[PDB]
C-alpha cells in the first residue's frame, strides 16, 4: 500500500572493535537483604555509590 520508511530512535556507530587496550575498571560488590551478592564494574575515576539497584 506504501513504501514506508521508519527508523528506531537510535543511531549506529561503526568504529573498530578492539580488545587489547581498554579503560581501566575495578569491580564493586553489592549484597542485598536477600543474602545474594552482585558484582558491577565501575570506572577507576568514579565514586562508588552506597546503594545499587541490582
Amino acid at each position: 500500500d506504501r513504501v514506508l520508511r521508519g527508523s528506531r530512535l537510535g543511531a549506529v556507530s561503526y568504529e573498530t572493535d578492539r580488545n587489547h587496550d581498554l579503560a581501566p575498571r575495578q569491580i564493586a560488590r553489592y549484597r542485598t537483604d536477600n543474602g545474594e551478592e552482585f558484582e558491577v564494574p565501575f570506572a577507576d575515576d568514579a565514586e562508588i555509590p552506597g546503594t545499587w539497584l541490582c
Binding site: 513504501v3 521508519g6 543511531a11 556507530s13 568504529e15
Partner: protein
C-alpha cells in the same frame, strides 16, 4: 439507429428488436437518488406505486424518531432532511484533492411531555458525499465506485435432509432476520420436534407453545392432524406455562437468578418487541408471501408474530406429513415446498443506496445513545437540540465507510469498458456476505435462474470464480432488491408488444418461450410446437397455446463485455470467459481505430460509459479548438465544453479527448461531439485491425508466442502513452524544518542543470532513472564524526554541512518528459495536513512502443507474449506485395475450441476487400435471407454481427466466394479463405496455401517494463533481517518450501546453505561476502541465521528452557 451522429454499421441481424437497451448506469444512479429523495425518483415512484414514497434518509429518520428518555419526561424528534448545493465542482474537487459533497440539514424538535414545550431548530449533520452524473463518488481527489452486493434475503427457509443410517427424511426450518436472534425448528430421527432457539441445545416445540401461552387442549385443537405434534405433547414431560417458561429461561440464560416478570418478558422482549428483533420490510414481505398471512395490507410492524410462529410450525409439520398445499386460517393458501438458498428469488441485491443507508443507521444509533445519555444528566429547561445532538459518530461512520472498506473500491479505469463494467458488478463477498476461504462450491455455480439476471460467462478467473458476477444487459432492480428482467406477453398464441418485468418467482410460476422462434408477422407462432423453459429449469417442447411469455431478444443472458465478442456462440465457455476478462485490460493507443467487424453493442456502451462528450441541446458549432467547443443553441445562449487533455487516469494511462466536429456543423441533442480514450467517431475501439496469417513460422510462434512486423513500430500503430506521478512533502521535524531548495549538500554542479531557481524541475526537461526531481534537504544537527572523515574534512577544508539531503529522485527504469508540476503551499492557505508545509507533485510521461515481452490478445481469448519483431522484408508477403503483420500459431486453435477467431478472420477479409453478390439471375439461395444492402459493399465497410443472431456459415462461404479485386485483376484469396504466400527470407513460395485475413487485436496492460525487477543488495526488514519484497522497493524473490525440496532432491547442500544463510539472514555474513566479492577473495563460511535466534528468544519467552548443548 436512434443515435443521431452515428457511423453507418450494416448489420447481419434477422430479428426485430422490440425493446431498446436501458441506460447502463441506472443500477447506480436510481439507487442513489432513491437514497436522497430526488424529485425524479419522486415522480417515478409516483407513477409506479405512490402509496408510500419515502427515501432512505426519511426512512432512517422515521425508524429512529422519536427518542425518549427512561422516565418519558421528554422526547426528541427528527424530520425533513434537506440538502444544500455542492460546495465545489467536479474538476476542482478532483484537482484540489478535496471530496465532493453537499451539506445536510435536519429539522430537529425537542418536546417536553409533562410541562409542554417544543424547541424546533435546524441542525447541520455534516457533509454528504454526492454522486456525480456517471455513478462515481469522488473521495479525496480520487474516484471511487461502490459496487453492489448479493446477500441472502431474510425470510423462512424450509429444507430437507436424509439420514445416513435410518434413511428417513428429516425436515428443518430456519427463520433468519436482520440483526435479530436466530430460531430454528427440526424433525429428528425420532418423532420429536426441536426448537433450538438462539443456538441452544433442544426442546420439544410444545414447551415453546406453552411458554407462549397455549394449553395442551389448544395444541391438540390446532395441531389435530399431526401424529408428530400429539406424540411430542404426550412426551413433553412438562405442564404449566410458568414451569415451561422457567425451563426455557434456564436453558437460555445460564447463571441468572430467575424472577417471574423477567422470565415472562424475556421471550417477548427477545422476539416480538421491535428494538432487539427486526427482519426488514423485505423480510416481512417474504414471510407474508411464503406463509400467506396477509395479502392486501401494506408492510408495517416488521417484528415477529406468534401467528407467524404457529403458521411456521404448521407449515413444517404439513411438509413432513407430505401435503402439497396448505391454508393458514385467515389467509389464502400457498403451495408447500422446500426452499433453495441459491435461487434468484432468495438472493437480494443490496445496492449503493442500501449500503450507505445501513452506514447512516449505524451512525445514528451511536448518536442517539449519547443523546439519551446526556438528556438526563444536564437539567431540563436548559437543553436545546443543538446541545443534544453530536454529529461526530455519524460523520465518522460515513467517512469510515467511504475509506477503508472492501465495497468502496478504487475505480478501475484503463478504458471506457473497464470503467463501465466496474459498475454493474454484483460482488457476493463483503461485510455481511460470505468470505473467500469458507465459500462452498454450491454457491459458485450457475443456477438456472440466472437467465437474464446475471452473466454466466463473465467472472474473474482467479480464486474468485462465481463469487463476482456482472449484471445482464436488460436487467433491472426491484424496490426490494430482486433482479427483474423484461418479457413479452403472448396472449393465446399471439405475441403482443406489451412488456412485463418478471422476477425469478414469477418466471418459475409461468412458462417462457424462446426468442428466435418464428413469429408469423402479426404475433402468431408458425410451427405448432415451441421450445420453452419450464419451472425447475428443465427445457421441454410445449404446444403453442400454453406459452404465455416470450423473451425480448436473444443475448438477454449476456453482459455488456460479453456482448462485444463477435461469433460468441462458436467459442467455448472458458475462452469466452478469458475474452470477456481481457477486453477490459486493453490500453488506449494514440490513434484508436474502429473495428472492421464488431457487434451492435459498441456505440451504446461508449456513449453510456461517460468518457465521450455528448451534446445536451441541438445547435450549430461556433468555434472548435483542441480545448473547447462552443455550440450556439437555438435560443441565444451558448455553452462551452472543455476537454480533458493528457490527464492521468487511475491506472497510469492517458485520458485524452479530441473533438470530431467542424467549425460550422449542425448538431442534434444526444450527438457525440468529442471522442474519448478508446473511441473512434463515437463507438468503442480498443485495438487495431492487423493482417494475420495462421501458419507456424520457424518456432518463433511456439506455444502462444506471437511474431509481429517492424511496421507496427515504424508507423506507431500499437503505441500508448503512460503517465506517472511523484510526490514529496516538506514538513517540520523536531530539529528544524525541511527545505525545498536547489542548495543541496555535497554534489556536483552538472546534476543541477535542469533544475530551476527554486528547486523543482522545469517543464519539458527529460529525466532518467537517478535524476533529481525535487531538491529537499532536511536538518541533521551535530553528531559524532569518525577520525578518518575528520582528517579528510581537515585536509580539504570543507565544513560539517549540518543538513542532510533527502531529495526526491525518479526511481529505477523510468524516463520521459516532465508534463506539469503541481505545487501546494501553506502560505497560499491550502488545506495541507498537520505538519506539512509544502507538497509538490511532478508528472512524468513516456510514450511506450511495442516490444518483445509485451502482451497482445484478441477478442476470443487468444493471448500471448510477443516473441520476435521481424524486419518488414523477411515476413511472408502475399502475391501482390503486402506483408502480413502478425503470425498466429495453428496448434492453439483446434484443441482450445475457439474458432470464433477463424470466422472473424474470414469475415474481416471480406469486409476489408468488399464484395458484390451478383444478383443477375436472381438472388442466390445462400443469400435468400440476407438483408438488402448487404448484397454489395465498398472496401473498408464496417459490418456488424450481433451475439446470438449473426452471420451464418453459408453466408460466410458465399461472401468469401465473391469479393472484388485489389487494383489489378487479382483475387488474392480464393474460395476457401486461403492465400498463396511467398516467403520473404528464402524467396521460394510456400508449398500449400495459408489462411489470411484481418483480425482485430488489442494491446494489454501486462507490459514488460512494469514487470522486470532485479536486486543485488537493497533494503532489509525490521524484526527479522530478511530482504523486503515487491517492485515498489528493490525487493528480493521468495525461495519457499517447494524450492527447498527441489534443492534437497537434487542433492545440492552448499547451494541451499548459501541461499538460506549468507543471502537472507547472516547479518555479519552479508557484509563479509560483499567485501570478499569486491576484493576478489574466497567466500567465507556461513554462520547461524538471525531468524533461528529470534525463534529461541520467543521460545524462552514462552517459559520454555531451550538450551543448545555442545558435545
Amino acid at each position: 439507429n436512434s443515435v443521431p451522429g452515428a457511423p453507418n454499421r450494416v448489420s447481419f441481424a434477422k430479428l426485430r428488436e422490440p425493446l431498446e437497451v436501458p441506460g447502463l448506469l441506472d443500477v447506480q444512479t436510481d439507487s442513489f437518488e432513491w437514497l436522497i429523495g430526488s424529485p425524479r425518483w419522486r415522480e417515478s415512484a409516483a407513477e409506479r406505486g405512490d402509496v408510500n414514497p419515502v427515501g432512505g434518509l426519511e426512512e432512517v429518520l422515521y425508524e429512529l424518531s422519536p427518542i425518549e428518555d427512561f422516565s418519558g419526561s421528554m422526547s426528541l424528534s427528527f424530520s425533513d432532511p434537506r440538502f444544500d448545493d455542492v460546495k465545489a465542482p467536479v474538476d476542482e474537487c478532483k484537482d484540489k484533492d478535496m471530496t465532493y459533497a453537499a451539506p445536510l440539514f435536519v429539522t430537529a424538535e425537542f418536546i417536553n411531555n409533562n410541562t409542554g414545550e417544543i424547541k424546533s431548530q435546524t441542525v447541520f449533520m455534516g457533509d454528504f458525499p454526492m454522486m456525480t452524473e456517471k455513478g462515481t463518488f469522488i473521495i479525496n481527489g480520487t474516484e471511487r465506485v461502490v459496487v453492489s452486493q448479493l446477500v441472502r434475503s431474510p425470510g423462512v427457509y424450509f429444507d430437507e435432509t436424509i439420514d445416513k443410517s435410518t434413511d428417513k427424511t428429516l425436515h428443518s426450518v430456519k427463520v433468519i432476520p436482520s440483526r435479530g436472534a436466530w430460531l430454528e425448528f427440526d424433525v429428528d430421527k425420532r418423532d420429536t420436534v426441536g426448537v433450538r432457539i438462539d443456538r441452544k441445545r433442544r426442546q420439544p416445540v410444545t414447551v415453546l407453545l406453552k411458554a407462549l401461552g397455549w394449553t395442551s387442549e389448544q395444541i391438540v385443537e390446532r395441531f389435530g392432524f399431526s401424529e408428530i405434534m400429539r406424540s411430542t405433547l404426550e412426551k413433553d414431560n412438562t405442564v404449566g406455562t410458568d414451569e415451561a417458561l422457567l425451563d426455557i429461561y434456564r436453558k437460555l440464560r445460564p447463571g441468572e437468578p430467575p424472577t417471574k416478570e423477567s422470565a415472562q418478558t424475556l421471550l417477548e422482549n427477545l422476539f416480538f418487541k421491535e428494538k432487539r428483533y427486526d427482519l426488514a420490510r423485505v423480510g416481512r414481505y417474504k414471510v407474508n408471501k411464503k406463509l400467506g398471512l396477509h395479502v392486501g395490507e401494506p408492510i408495517t410492524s416488521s417484528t415477529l408474530t406468534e401467528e407467524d410462529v404457529v403458521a411456521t410450525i404448521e407449515y413444517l409439520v404439513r411438509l413432513h406429513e407430505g401435503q402439497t398445499t396448505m391454508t393458514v386460517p385467515g389467509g389464502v393458501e400457498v403451495p408447500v415446498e422446500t426452499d433453495d438458498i441459491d435461487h434468484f428469488g432468495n438472493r437480494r441485491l443490496r445496492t449503493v443506496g442500501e449500503l450507505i443507508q445501513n452506514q447512516i443507521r449505524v451512525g445514528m444509533s451511536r448518536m442517539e445513545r449519547v443523546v439519551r445519555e446526556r438528556m438526563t444528566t444536564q437539567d431540563v429547561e436548559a437543553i436545546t437540540p443543538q446541545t443534544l445532538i453530536n454529529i461526530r459518530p455519524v460523520v465518522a461512520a460515513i467517512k469510515e465507510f467511504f475509506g477503508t472498506s472492501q465495497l468502496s473500491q478504487f475505480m478501475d479505469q484503463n478504458n471506457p469498458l473497464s470503467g463501465l463494467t466496474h459498475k454493474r458488478r454484483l460482488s457476493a463477498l463483503g461485510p455481511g456476505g460470505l468470505s473467500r476461504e469458507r465459500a462452498g462450491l454450491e454457491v459458485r455455480d450457475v443456477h438456472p435462474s440466472h437467465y437474464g439476471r446475471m452473466c454466466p460467462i463473465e467472472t474473474p478467473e482467479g480464486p474468485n470464480i462465481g463469487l463476482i458476477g456482472s449484471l445482464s444487459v436488460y436487467a433491472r432492480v426491484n424496490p426490494f432488491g430482486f433482479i427483474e428482467t423484461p418479457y413479452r406477453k403472448v396472449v393465446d398464441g399471439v405475441v403482443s408488444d406489451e412488456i412485463v418485468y418478471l422476477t425469478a418467482d414469477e418466471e418459475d410460476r409461468h412458462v417462457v418461450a424462446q426468442a428466435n422462434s418464428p413469429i408469423d408477422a402479426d404475433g402468431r407462432f408458425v410451427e405448432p410446437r415451441v421450445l420453452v423453459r419450464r419451472k425447475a429449469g428443465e427445457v421441454e417442447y410445449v404446444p403453442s397455446s400454453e406459452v404465455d411469455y416470450m423473451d425480448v431478444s436473444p443475448r438477454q443472458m449476456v453482459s455488456v463485455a460479453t456482448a462485444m465478442i463477435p461469433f460468441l456462440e462458436h467459442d467455448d465457455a472458458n475462452r469466452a470467459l478469458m475474452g470477456a476478462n481481457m477486453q477490459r485490460q486493453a490500453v488506449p493507443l494514440v490513434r484508436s481505430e474502429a473495428p472492421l467487424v464488431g457487434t451492435g453493442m459498441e456505440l451504446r456502451a461508449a456513449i453510456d460509459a461517460g468518457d465521450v462528450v455528448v451534446a445536451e441541446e441541438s445547435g450549430v458549432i461556433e468555434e472548435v479548438s483542441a480545448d473547447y467547443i462552443t455550440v450556439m443553441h437555438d435560443n441565444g445562449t451558448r455553452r462551452t465544453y472543455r476537454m480533458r487533455k493528457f490527464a492521468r487516469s487511475n491506472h497510469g494511462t492517458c485520458a485524452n479527448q479530441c473533438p470530431i466536429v467542424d467549425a460550422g456543423d449542425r448538431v442534434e441533442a444526444g450527438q457525440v461531439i468529442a471522442d474519448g480514450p478508446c473511441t473512434d467517431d463515437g463507438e468503442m475501439a480498443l485495438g487495431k485491425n492487423l493482417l494475420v496469417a495462421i501458419m507456424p513460422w520457424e518456432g518463433h510462434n511456439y506455444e502462444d508466442a506471437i511474431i509481429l512486423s517492424n511496421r507496427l513500430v515504424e508507423e506507431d500503430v500499437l503505441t500508448s502513452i503512460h503517465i506517472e506521478e511523484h510526490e514529496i512533502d516538506a514538513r517540520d521535524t523536531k530539529l528544524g524544518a525541511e527545505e525545498i531548495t536547489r542548495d543541496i549538500p555535497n554534489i556536483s554542479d552538472e546534476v543541477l542543470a535542469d533544475l530551476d531557481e527554486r528547486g523543482i524541475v522545469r517543464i519539458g526537461a527529460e529525466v532518467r532513472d537517478g535524476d533529481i526531481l525535487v531538491g529537499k534537504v532536511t536538518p541533521k544537527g551535530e553528531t559524532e564524526l569518525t577520525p578518518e572523515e575528520r582528517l579528510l574534512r581537515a585536509i580539504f577544508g570543507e565544513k560539517a554541512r549540518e543538513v542532510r539531503d533527502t531529495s526526491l529522485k525518479v526511481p529505477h527504469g523510468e524516463s520521459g518528459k516532465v508534463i506539469g508540476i503541481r505545487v501546494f503551499s501553506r502560505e497560499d492557505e491550502d488545506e495541507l495536513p498537520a505538519g506539512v508545509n509544502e507538497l509538490v507533485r511532478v508528472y512524468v510521461a513516456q510514450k511506450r512502443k511495442i516490444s518483445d515481452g509485451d502482451k497482445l490478445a484478441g477478442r476470443h481469448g487468444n493471448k500471448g507474449v510477443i516473441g520476435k519483431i521481424l524486419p518488414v522484408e523477411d515476413m511472408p508477403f502475399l502475391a501482390d506485395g503486402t506483408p502480413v503483420d502478425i503470425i498466429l500459431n495453428t496448434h492453439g486453435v483446434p484443441r482450445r475450441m475457439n474458432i470464433g477467431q477463424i470466422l472473424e478472420t474470414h469475415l474481416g477479409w471480406c469486409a476489408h476487400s468488399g464484395w458484390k453478390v451478383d444478383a443477375a439471375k436472381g438472388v442466390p439461395d445462400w443469400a435468400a435471407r440476407l438483408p438488402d444492402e448487404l448484397l454489395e459493399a465498398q472496401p473498408n465497410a464496417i459490418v456488424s454481427t450481433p451475439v446470438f443472431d449473426g452471420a451464418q456459415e453459408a453466408e460466410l462461404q458465399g461472401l468469401l466466394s465473391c469479393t472484388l479485386p485489389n487494383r489489378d485483376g487479382d483475387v488474392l484469396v480464393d474460395a476457401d479463405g486461403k492465400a498463396m504466400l511467398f516467403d520473404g527470407r528464402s524467396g521460394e513460395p510456400f508449398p500449400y496455401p495459408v489462411t489470411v485475413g484481418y483480425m482485430y487485436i488489442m494491446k494489454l496492460h501486462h507490459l514488460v517494463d512494469d514487470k522486470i525487477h532485479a536486486r543485488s543488495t537493497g533494503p532489509y526488514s525490521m524484526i527479522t533481517q530478511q530482504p523486503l519484497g515487491g517492485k515498489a522497493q528493490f525487493g528480493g524473490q521468495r525461495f519457499g518450501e517447494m524450492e527447498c525440496w527441489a534443492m534437497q532432491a537434487y542433492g545440492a547442500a552448499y547451494t541451499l546453505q548459501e541461499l538460506l544463510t549468507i543471502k537472507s539472514d547472516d547479518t555479519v555474513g552479508r557484509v563479509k561476502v560483499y567485501e570478499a566479492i569486491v576484493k576478489g577473495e574466497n567466500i567465507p563460511e556461513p554462520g547461524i541465521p538471525e531468524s533461528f535466534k529470534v525463534l529461541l528468544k520467543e521460545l524462552q519467552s514462552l517459559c520454555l528452557n531451550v538450551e543448545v548443548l555442545s558435545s
